[PDB]
Amino acid sequence: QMRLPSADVYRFAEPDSEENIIFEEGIPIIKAGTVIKLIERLTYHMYADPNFVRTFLTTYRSFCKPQELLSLIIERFEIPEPEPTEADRIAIENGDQPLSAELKRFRKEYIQPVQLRVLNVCRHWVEHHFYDFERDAYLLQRMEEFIGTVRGKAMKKWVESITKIIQRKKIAHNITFQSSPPTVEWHISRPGHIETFDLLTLHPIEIARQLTLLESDLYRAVQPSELVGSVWTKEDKEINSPNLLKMIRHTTNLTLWFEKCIVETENLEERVAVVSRIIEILQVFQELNNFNGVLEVVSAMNSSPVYRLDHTFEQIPSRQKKILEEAHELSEDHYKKYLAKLRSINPPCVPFFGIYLTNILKTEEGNPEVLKRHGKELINFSKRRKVAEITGEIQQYQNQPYCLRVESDIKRFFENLNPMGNSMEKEFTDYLFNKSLEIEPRNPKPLPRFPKKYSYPLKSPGVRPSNPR
Amino acid sequence: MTEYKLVVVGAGGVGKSALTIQLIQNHFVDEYDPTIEDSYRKQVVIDGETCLLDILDTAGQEEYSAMRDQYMRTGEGFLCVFAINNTKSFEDIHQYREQIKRVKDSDDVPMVLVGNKCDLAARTVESRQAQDLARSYGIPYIETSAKTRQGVEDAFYTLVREIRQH
Amino acid sequence: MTEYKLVVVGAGGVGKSALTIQLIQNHFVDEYDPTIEDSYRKQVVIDGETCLLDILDTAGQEEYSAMRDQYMRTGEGFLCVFAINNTKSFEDIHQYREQIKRVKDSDDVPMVLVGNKCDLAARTVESRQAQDLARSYGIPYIETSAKTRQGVEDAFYTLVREIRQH
Numbered sequence A: 001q002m003r004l005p006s007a008d009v010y011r012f013a014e015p016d017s018e019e020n021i022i023f024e025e026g027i028p029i030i031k032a033g034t035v036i037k038l039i040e041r042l043t044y045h046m047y048a049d050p051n052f053v054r055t056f057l058t059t060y061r062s063f064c065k066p067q068e069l070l071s072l073i074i075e076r077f078e079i080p081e082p083e084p085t086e087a088d089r090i091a092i093e094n095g096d097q098p099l100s101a102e103l104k105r106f107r108k109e110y111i112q113p114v115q116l117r118v119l120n121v122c123r124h125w126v127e128h129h130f131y132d133f134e135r136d137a138y139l140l141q142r143m144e145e146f147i148g149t150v151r152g153k154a155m156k157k158w159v160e161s162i163t164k165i166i167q168r169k170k171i172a173h174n175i176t177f178q179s180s181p182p183t184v185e186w187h188i189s190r191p192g193h194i195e196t197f198d199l200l201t202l203h204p205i206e207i208a209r210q211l212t213l214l215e216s217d218l219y220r221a222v223q224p225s226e227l228v229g230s231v232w233t234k235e236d237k238e239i240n241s242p243n244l245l246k247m248i249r250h251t252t253n254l255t256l257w258f259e260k261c262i263v264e265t266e267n268l269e270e271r272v273a274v275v276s277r278i279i280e281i282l283q284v285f286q287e288l289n290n291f292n293g294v295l296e297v298v299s300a301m302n303s304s305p306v307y308r309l310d311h312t313f314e315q316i317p318s319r320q321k322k323i324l325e326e327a328h329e330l331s332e333d334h335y336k337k338y339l340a341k342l343r344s345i346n347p348p349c350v351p352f353f354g355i356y357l358t359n360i361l362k363t364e365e366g367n368p369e370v371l372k373r374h375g376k377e378l379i380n381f382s383k384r385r386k387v388a389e390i391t392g393e394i395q396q397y398q399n400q401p402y403c404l405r406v407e408s409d410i411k412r413f414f415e416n417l418n419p420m421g422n423s424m425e426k427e428f429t430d431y432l433f434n435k436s437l438e439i440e441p442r443n444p445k446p447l448p449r450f451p452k453k454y455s456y457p458l459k460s461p462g463v464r465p466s467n468p469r
Numbered sequence B, C: 001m002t003e004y005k006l007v008v009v010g011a012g013g014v015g016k017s018a019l020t021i022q023l024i025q026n027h028f029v030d031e032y033d034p035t036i037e038d039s040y041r042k043q044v045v046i047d048g049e050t051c052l053l054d055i056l057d058t059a060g061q062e063e064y065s066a067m068r069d070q071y072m073r074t075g076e077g078f079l080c081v082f083a084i085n086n087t088k089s090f091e092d093i094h095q096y097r098e099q100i101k102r103v104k105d106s107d108d109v110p111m112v113l114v115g116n117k118c119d120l121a122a123r124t125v126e127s128r129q130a131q132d133l134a135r136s137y138g139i140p141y142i143e144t145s146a147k148t149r150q151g152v153e154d155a156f157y158t159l160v161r162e163i164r165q166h
């Protein structure tokens, strides 16, 4: 077989037992275990699991502190070499050079793979979870000292590599595309005249494209640290989940802006034009696989102020009612259609984050942090593999970039959108609803008429792109 | 058989998902995976009649405030939850009730007020306060501890009874 | 949606990591940072069918036994890479092919011969030579450039089709 070091000088040698490591009922999958056992598997010498490394580096803070994680992997790296075998002693005692077949097998099959995987955990730690180091300066000094004490011709390759990555992170991403981005489309408003920009004056195709770029960047900016431990729901959410909250807020302001554009267009004929344009934007969103965008529109159409406008929707063409209906159907029966849709599209895409938040939360509130066995308290790692499975899925959709050209002014126009103004949620929400009652009173109150407000043609240019450029 | 769409509303952190979980999941299994089908349906017998509970839980999505109307509209009954150690969440109830009344376009919407005990912190809302608020709205008041599974079934079953008698 | 397990192997420095990050992020890694073991996930629609690609990026450093057989056990398709301006990397190809053929124990393991860095002008490996090797193994030969994306999808997706048709 192969003799491991003494469990008295190397803790990571204690044998597996029902009291320190539980496996899931084709590498083994850990259900639970001690921090020591978990770190042993994190850097095992038999197989490999980049998947374990991410799960661990993403969730360990709840069951082990950073300073402690580092001490532990340094101990893990510090493997003691075995004693000369009887054969070797015989040779040495005779003045000849020992073959040391066991020492060499032990270095090749245990030490090499373990030390390398420890360095690997260090590379990833520093490379994608550098925040642990920004918040703890001493932790970083220790990492540097450690990496700097690593002697060896072999290790040299990686030591240098990790040192550079560490410095690159202390000091302060270009994209190449298959084909070229389609030409930016203009309608009534022209380049430079940002004073005219509005829901109907900009080309609907372009509105969907620019919002899709905005929404995609917002999506790709959410880091796993903003999701783990359900921190976006704690009182320090503004500090721990800034990127997430920024993205959710954009979605809200956009849904509200859509609602405002509708209910503030008192004239029925013009409001119908407004609603049609929004449904057309929805159409392009589906095309671009921007589900976040599709839901913002679905949400607006289903809000109290808009939902009740029967006279408006009665005048919407069938092709569009159908588009809106299928879109609405995505969220029915607990997002069944949507989940299926998302699993089948060819990205890039911009998923709806709501689903992930709900699952991550239920997973954190429905699984114990530890599992007790014979008194001993093991770390419930399966709970962690479940949260990481979700953060991984989120990350998978963050890689693929959209091949769309940014239009600085339209982007700016949408970034400064502020439907609510200086009002508070309730006051504004009530305002929109009263407007809805004004433009289309509750039965049997008669339906009034109102003067038009738009001075430009309301005909949409349509959502089919043009070729010239 | 009949299916009741029950919706759990209330500020974030009050323990809405914990309630939903406590009711639907199997409390006698080491692992729970919310990313698995029908983790929202549950067949139960209430007052003899056998029905199917479909719980609409959106915990974690509190921030998507403009998606609220949509989520609510399909509910037939509502659990208005709040934390007993969180006065804010309690003072939030009034508006949650008004939002439900608006989206359902009705003044007689089946609902229950639920005071949940999340942790061992200092209670800051006394049940009398809640009882009185609940009475002014003409609705049932139920205190819970999803953490010890106390009062959970009671809160949902009471809501279903409200629907059956509406 | 089906899941495919791709493994990228080959001498250190040939561009195994660059090709993968170009595929996954449409970004060209211009600096050198030795790989120990990395994994990437990618959902993509190939030939009208939605796939979930699991790509394992290995360490080229040809002085790491044991760890090798370890990852070739699970992989179902292999990308054998060499740089067209590194004759030694091309001559290491047969080693990898033999090792896979052995680990997975079979003579028809789905693979693709990939000659990378075809953007560079200083070519020291002739397409004809590479091609001859691919024909001897009964696999396709695809020249790529992680820098310009040239042939990148072709290589990875061709491998997917081979795993599907195997």
Ligand SMILES: Nc1nc2c(ncn2[C@@H]2O[C@H](COP(=O)(O)OP(=O)(O)NP(=O)(O)O)[C@@H](O)[C@H]2O)c(=O)[nH]1
Binding pocket: C010, C011, C012, C013, C014, C015, C016, C017, C018, C019, C029, C030, C031, C032, C033, C034, C035, C036, C058, C059, C060, C061, C116, C117, C118, C119, C120, C144, C145, C146, C147, C148
């Ligand atoms: N001009 C050019 N340089 C390339 C190309 N692909 C990789 N390189 C360069 O070659 C070097 C090594 O690439 P890399 O992807 O790290 O190689 P690897 O095979 O993963 N190395 P290892 O096995 O050590 O992890 C880098 O400096 C990278 O930018 C290519 O197509 N063109």
Ligand SMILES: [Mg+2]
Binding pocket: C016, C017, C018, C033, C034, C035, C057, C058, C059, C060
């Ligand atoms: Mg590499």
